[PDB]
Design a protein around this motif. Sequence first.
Motif, mmCIF file in Angstrom:
data_model
loop_
_atom_site.group_PDB
_atom_site.id
_atom_site.type_symbol
_atom_site.label_atom_id
_atom_site.label_comp_id
_atom_site.label_asym_id
_atom_site.label_seq_id
_atom_site.Cartn_x
_atom_site.Cartn_y
_atom_site.Cartn_z
ATOM 1 N N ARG A 145 0.758 -1.218 0.000
ATOM 2 C CA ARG A 145 0.000 0.000 0.000
ATOM 3 C C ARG A 145 0.818 1.315 0.000
ATOM 4 O O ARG A 145 0.698 2.129 -0.923
ATOM 5 C CB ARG A 145 -0.883 -0.061 1.245
ATOM 6 N N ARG B 141 -2.441 -15.709 -2.826
ATOM 7 C CA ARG B 141 -2.836 -14.786 -1.754
ATOM 8 C C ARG B 141 -1.670 -14.458 -0.828
ATOM 9 O O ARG B 141 -1.810 -13.612 0.039
ATOM 10 C CB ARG B 141 -3.981 -15.356 -0.899
ATOM 11 N N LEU B 210 -10.701 -10.749 5.351
ATOM 12 C CA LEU B 210 -10.000 -10.781 4.061
ATOM 13 C C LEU B 210 -10.971 -11.037 2.900
ATOM 14 O O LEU B 210 -10.642 -10.807 1.768
ATOM 15 C CB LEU B 210 -8.874 -11.839 4.071
ATOM 16 N N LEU B 214 -12.283 -3.635 3.034
ATOM 17 C CA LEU B 214 -11.735 -3.144 4.284
ATOM 18 C C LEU B 214 -12.751 -2.500 5.205
ATOM 19 O O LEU B 214 -12.813 -2.868 6.374
ATOM 20 C CB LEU B 214 -10.580 -2.179 4.011
ATOM 21 N N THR C 109 -1.149 1.843 8.593
ATOM 22 C CA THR C 109 -1.957 1.111 7.616
ATOM 23 C C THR C 109 -2.942 1.962 6.774
ATOM 24 O O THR C 109 -3.531 1.427 5.829
ATOM 25 C CB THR C 109 -2.763 0.016 8.313
ATOM 26 N N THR C 110 -3.147 3.238 7.106
ATOM 27 C CA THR C 110 -4.129 4.082 6.374
ATOM 28 C C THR C 110 -3.615 5.456 5.885
ATOM 29 O O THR C 110 -4.411 6.265 5.396
ATOM 30 C CB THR C 110 -5.410 4.350 7.214
ATOM 31 N N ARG C 139 -6.702 -4.065 9.183
ATOM 32 C CA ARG C 139 -5.916 -3.134 8.376
ATOM 33 C C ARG C 139 -4.491 -3.643 8.148
ATOM 34 O O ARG C 139 -3.972 -3.555 7.040
ATOM 35 C CB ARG C 139 -5.885 -1.743 9.016
ATOM 36 N N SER C 141 -3.621 -6.628 8.025
ATOM 37 C CA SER C 141 -3.737 -7.739 7.115
ATOM 38 C C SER C 141 -3.799 -7.335 5.637
ATOM 39 O O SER C 141 -3.618 -8.194 4.763
ATOM 40 C CB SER C 141 -4.951 -8.641 7.450
ATOM 41 N N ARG C 142 -4.064 -6.064 5.351
ATOM 42 C CA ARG C 142 -4.031 -5.558 3.960
ATOM 43 C C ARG C 142 -2.633 -5.105 3.552
ATOM 44 O O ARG C 142 -2.404 -4.836 2.412
ATOM 45 C CB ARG C 142 -4.970 -4.371 3.764
ATOM 46 N N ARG C 146 -0.254 -12.699 4.843
ATOM 47 C CA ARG C 146 -1.176 -13.436 5.679
ATOM 48 C C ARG C 146 -0.614 -13.933 7.044
ATOM 49 O O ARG C 146 -1.129 -13.550 8.111
ATOM 50 C CB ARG C 146 -1.624 -14.613 4.845
ATOM 51 N N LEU C 211 -8.535 0.048 -4.909
ATOM 52 C CA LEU C 211 -8.294 -1.133 -4.097
ATOM 53 C C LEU C 211 -9.595 -1.823 -3.693
ATOM 54 O O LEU C 211 -9.568 -2.953 -3.286
ATOM 55 C CB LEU C 211 -7.479 -0.761 -2.845
ATOM 56 N N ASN C 212 -10.721 -1.118 -3.762
ATOM 57 C CA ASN C 212 -12.040 -1.671 -3.368
ATOM 58 C C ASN C 212 -12.822 -2.388 -4.464
ATOM 59 O O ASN C 212 -13.939 -2.856 -4.222
ATOM 60 C CB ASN C 212 -12.866 -0.522 -2.763
#
Lengths: 252, 252, 253, 253, 266, 254
Positions: A145, B141, B210, B214, C109-110, C139, C141-142, C146, C211-212
């Motif tokens: 990100r 993934r 997941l 989000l 994370t944001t 968050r 986790s994005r 994993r 991303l969404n």
Amino acid sequence: FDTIKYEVDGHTATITLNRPDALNALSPHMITELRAAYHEAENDDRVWLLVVTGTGRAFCSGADVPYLSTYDQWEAPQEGTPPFRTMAKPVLTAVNGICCGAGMDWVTTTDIVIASEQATFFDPHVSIGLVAGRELVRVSRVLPRSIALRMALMGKHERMSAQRAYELGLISEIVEHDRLLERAHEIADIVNSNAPLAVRGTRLAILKGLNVPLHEAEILAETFRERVLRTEDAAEGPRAFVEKRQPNWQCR
Amino acid sequence: FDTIKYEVDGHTATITLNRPDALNALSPHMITELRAAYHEAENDDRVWLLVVTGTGRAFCSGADVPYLSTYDQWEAPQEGTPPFRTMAKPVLTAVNGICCGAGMDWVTTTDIVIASEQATFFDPHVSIGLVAGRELVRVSRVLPRSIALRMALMGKHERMSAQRAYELGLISEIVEHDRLLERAHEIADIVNSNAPLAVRGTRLAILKGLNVPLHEAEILAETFRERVLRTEDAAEGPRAFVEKRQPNWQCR
Amino acid sequence: DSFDTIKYEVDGHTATITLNRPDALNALSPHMITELRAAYHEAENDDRVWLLVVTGTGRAFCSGADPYLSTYDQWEAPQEGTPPFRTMAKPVLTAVNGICCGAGMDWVTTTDIVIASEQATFFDPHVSIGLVAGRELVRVSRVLPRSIALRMALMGKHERMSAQRAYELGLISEIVEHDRLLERAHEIADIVNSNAPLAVRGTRLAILKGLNVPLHEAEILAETFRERVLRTEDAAEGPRAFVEKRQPNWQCR
Amino acid sequence: SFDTIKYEVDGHTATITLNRPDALNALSPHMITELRAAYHEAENDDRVWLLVVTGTGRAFCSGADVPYLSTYDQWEAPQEGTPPFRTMAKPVLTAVNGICCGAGMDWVTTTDIVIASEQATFFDPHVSIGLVAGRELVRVSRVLPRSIALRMALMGKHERMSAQRAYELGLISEIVEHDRLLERAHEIADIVNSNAPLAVRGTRLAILKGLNVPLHEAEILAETFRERVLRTEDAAEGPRAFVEKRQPNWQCR
Amino acid sequence: SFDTIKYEVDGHTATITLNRPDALNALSPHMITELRAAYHEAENDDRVWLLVVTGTGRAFCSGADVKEIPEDGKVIYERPYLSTYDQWEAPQEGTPPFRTMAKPVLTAVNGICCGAGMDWVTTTDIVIASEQATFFDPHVSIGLVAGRELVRVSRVLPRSIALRMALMGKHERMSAQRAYELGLISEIVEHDRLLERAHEIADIVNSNAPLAVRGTRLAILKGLNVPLHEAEILAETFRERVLRTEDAAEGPRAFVEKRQPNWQCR
Amino acid sequence: SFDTIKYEVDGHTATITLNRPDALNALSPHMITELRAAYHEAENDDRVWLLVVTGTGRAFCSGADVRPYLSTYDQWEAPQEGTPPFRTMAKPVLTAVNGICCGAGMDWVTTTDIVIASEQATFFDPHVSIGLVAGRELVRVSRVLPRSIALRMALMGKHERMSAQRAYELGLISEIVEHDRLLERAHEIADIVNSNAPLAVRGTRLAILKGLNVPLHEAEILAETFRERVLRTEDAAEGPRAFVEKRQPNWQCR
């Protein structure tokens, strides 16, 4: 072709961006030539895999700085992007140098990406007042990100090194500069030693799977697995495997 | 069991793949034994965490190379996959060697993954003429786009090292080979020193999160947080802290 | 309108918010959260501000958190210190000066650029006190792969991720010598602000809204932001300055 | 043998009848346990191809009557009487004989064929007693249009949707004369069971797994179930019977 | 006082009336500003539990003022181009802020409802109409794309009904009867009784527990954004929030004591 | 010239007529090849703004009849049979269902933009009755009919037929037409659509159809792309001007 080279050797087609004096900047003419080359590779049954590379200090330095009558005009312009949504044959990119703006499309939409120790990666659009939409939404699917966002925001004032690209998995391998093309063709030969319809089916399983949640991605992947199971090559392979033998795949 | 070992010590169950003479290849019998071991772990209230590991030079070298009357036949076969969608207890995988094909399922669907310095990771299916659907949608993934695709396309002809796996976060730690099981149990003990229902709830928040965007993932996670807030352990935690003593988790 | 728990300062086109409760290792109280949200709103609505830097005083960046259902926010996950990244257009850079745990991870994370001191560490202690980390770890986790995210969740307070490991995985983009953190943060801020601010904003939106949805839709969606920026004066000035080999003069219009 | 329901098998149809008419077929914990045992029995009896669920008297089901976290189900929404549509492949038909509210709606929203008596009514009373009917109404929202589902949620016990309106919107597929309800449910069941049962099951899975993803992916996904059914003996028998102008003889293999 | 709308509170109900009947309740930039202030007022007044929106005259709302269509494509806001976040998204026109408000909204459609008028029909919680009401979108007839409006319509009407409405433009109008048939509206009301019936429905909703009403609305609406199974789990968050309210204790307590509940909205 | 269909252009409307009434317009491989040629022709002829599809006789389309493997990209996904290429063609399509519509026939009902039908039309899918799964067809039906209606159609096979009246009631179709006036009404609707600005029509259709693939909020933002593309057209300046001047617009499809 005047702006690229297109060569076939066995099952590998190689496209070389060949405008080194313009640092392989994409002109409309180059883009038209690239699309003809892609179509040629997709439709030549002898070609199983496409390699894309450049010449000189740049791999690709980006684009050179009737309306709505065709469907493509309703979506983002594609520039040099290989047709990864409509072609099943795998593509390897070998990044020989500067890779920026629309150059990143090869990094973000081909299957295997390697680079010369000299390669660098960036996007200069915000530095000339424009939004690089397509390019950077694609980068965002490879880099974490805040790395994707930093690249976007820094524009031409920062370049990601090959070493950092490798660290994050933007590329899979760094190659000594003079051996780049040789290693690209070696990897190509290795992929082509596997069953080509299995390779194509696996790539589709992965790529279509990325669009849905994992559980659905598993069930979806069964379609490609079942299609490949019916191939002659899928009947030959398992016997060859137990005999540690390389079969003469028929791509059927 | 004749193909695995199952042992419980305090709050940790350890499953050991124990067919070194077939390099821990999964047979139907081994698969049946694994599923019985998983069920046992899930249903024994003393067990809070499952460790999976292998014996010898392979962790797991893959599968050995009435119709539609049961629900599982409608979906992808699962082979050795632990039941991560239907079990709340965390699972740690300690990869002791070769890990390929179905072996990757432990790497891609368990919660903590560590490896011996000697571990390697790959998938040979395209080399056998087949699509490894389930396995590679899962790999996709965890590894970045072109790294997952390179693994899929190279088949048996390339192996990812433990060092490269660590670099990309496919594993969280590399361990001296002879200390692998010891370190796995140390990590297990540490996890189990935390509140087990909070651990389970947090794992569910992440994993169910997941599957959705989000913003929804954040709201969804509140369900697990609210469930845990009602637990006796959520009261014991701050009480033990104010009394300057170790919390005594009762898993309720 | 004067803050007790943070500092808010504007220098040129950069606003800097500094978490300023060093005695509590910059833990978030409800009062601090209210102050942060006022500062975020101020930065978002002041046309002079193009970019926000967030950082902490002392040796902790942020050590986490310390009528009913009458307001909409109470129905969703509490946001704590999270900048309102879904309803702001200006970019945010976080400079992590030390310990960053629990709710502290929200900035990591944001926000858009994340850098850290060589002394920063990252973790989440919730499971160690019997509670679930929801928002925070979904968050994380994005960003982290994993089983790295899940390890952080499961280890609780008993493990720290180093700045070096963070950098390796791309949780942060840069490690900075501790005494030079703020200087480097403002340097990056200046460099971003030397680019065309509406293009920066549009590109950030392309990425974040993209991303969404799936990639293909993300590409088409991004065209909206590209088309909006194309109408700006800056979009004409940029290529003009380039062809004339001179610095552009952005007007943010 | 059950004390709150009846379970009967006739040929390839299992029929579960909610059988506490004096309590208007309110779901007690004991009834819920009995239902689940009946569902499990239906799913595991190879003779059973289809399940019919119905009630007795003036209510089909009037809702629920007005160790912790040790089992996985406790992490999700309680399921109450819901048939196990996510883990059972055999089709289920619901025949709504009267009042259907709260948890009663689960049969309307998660079974495959839903018919009703002219006397049936549909509603959810939860907001009238201060509570949120989460599971029930997220499910209703997949069947009724947006503001119809919301109106049902917001009106609580104070409004009841008629069988006629239910039919108009496709909440139910058929309205039946009250005294003919059970006859017609069994007739429909017999018709479905005259088709190839594995094809029926595969088609149902195509549709239901397909609803979770976009249409294009749903098409590709459906190919898996189609391929699985193609390998059945019944898939050979069907076209063979047709070419020989003869009735097929399904073996469910 | 507002000059393009009326805003009135009675008990727990706020009523917004679009009040430019001579302009067929076309939305001007000034009307839009007034609507947003009225929405904010309703959301922040604790006495208000529910908002009713209706219009005056032959139109409920005839859309965004065509007279105000920007020559140069830039949607005009109070502020400079792209200086505020909202300018990066689709303009919202009169849309109530359903994504950031918890109180339910009922729309009573008194007549013509087209273009941006459809936003009330597609994003409010209860929608009723006069027997005279009609529904359409004229954008393609003036050379423009209805984006926001029709993506919203497509979540309520079946596929080819939504597309027919898009494609026919101003040349076809859906009747109240057809709208009812497809569930675009829940009720058709005699024209002169429209407002009265709206307030009756409002009173019924407000006789239920208001936090349970709000929580249930959120369960449904946030649930529409994910698959069903996740929707069920997600809805538990709202259910748990409501379970901690006094009203949630009062409701079942009143029932066991065979007496009427008394809601405190806490 | 086509043997199994008719293709005719009149002004801005192309009309494809399924024309194998002796086989109740069952799709053969030859018919499918002809349909795809007709679709391509309509998509590429700039004079054509809209495509009408209809059938001849008692059937609109009664379904399907009873190249090296994986060498072409289409083989990697579900066979499409007669489906118009709605994912890659921007021009709207109207289907006028003149009779029996089953199996593959439902593809026109579920993937075209305006669907009307004769009072005589019926809708169903017979696959489960011959032991097969109709995957593509019924996942598409499931996007138009409510849950248990789609499932009932799937499970009942050939033993039940949905009437035109029921199809209208649920919005599977938008209009029922007197049988002998079906084609006339189809062409009237076509003319009315084509009296609107064609690039606005195409852009709006895309907003809706691409929007259905993502959540609502993203769908709104995504729709702005099409709206922005259309704003640059001459027709987008002509349309509002004609409206404010109370006069007919003159569309140039530019």
